[PDB]
Amino acid sequence: ALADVCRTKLPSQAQDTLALIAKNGPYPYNRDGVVFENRESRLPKKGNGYYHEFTVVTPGDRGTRRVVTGGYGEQYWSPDHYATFQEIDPRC
Ligand SMILES: OC[C@H]1O[C@@H](O)[C@H](O)[C@@H](O)[C@@H]1O
Residue environment code for 13-43, b if the CB has 16+ CB neighbours within 10 A, otherwise e = ebbebbebbeeeeeeeeeebeeebebeeeeb
Tell me, yes or no, if 53 is annotated catalytic: yes
Distance of CA 4 to the CA centre of its chain: 13
Domains, in order of start, for the chain:
1-92 (3.10.450.30)
Amino acid at 85: F
Of ligand 1's listed atoms, the one at least distance from the Cα of 32 is 1
Technique used to solve these coordinates: X-ray
The number of CA neighbours under 13 Å toward the Cβ of 74 is 17
Query: In angstroms, what CA-CA distances link 63 with 12, 28, 80?
Result: 15, 13, 9
Q: Which residues line ligand 1 (CB under 6 A)?
A: 29-31, 62
Query: In angstroms, what CA-CA distances link 16 with 2, 31, 73, 80, 83?
Result: 23, 17, 16, 18, 22
The number of CA neighbours under 13 Å toward the Cβ of 75 is 20
- Considering only CA atoms, which residue is closest to atom 6 of ligand 1? 29
Q: What is the resolution of this structure in A?
A: 1.8
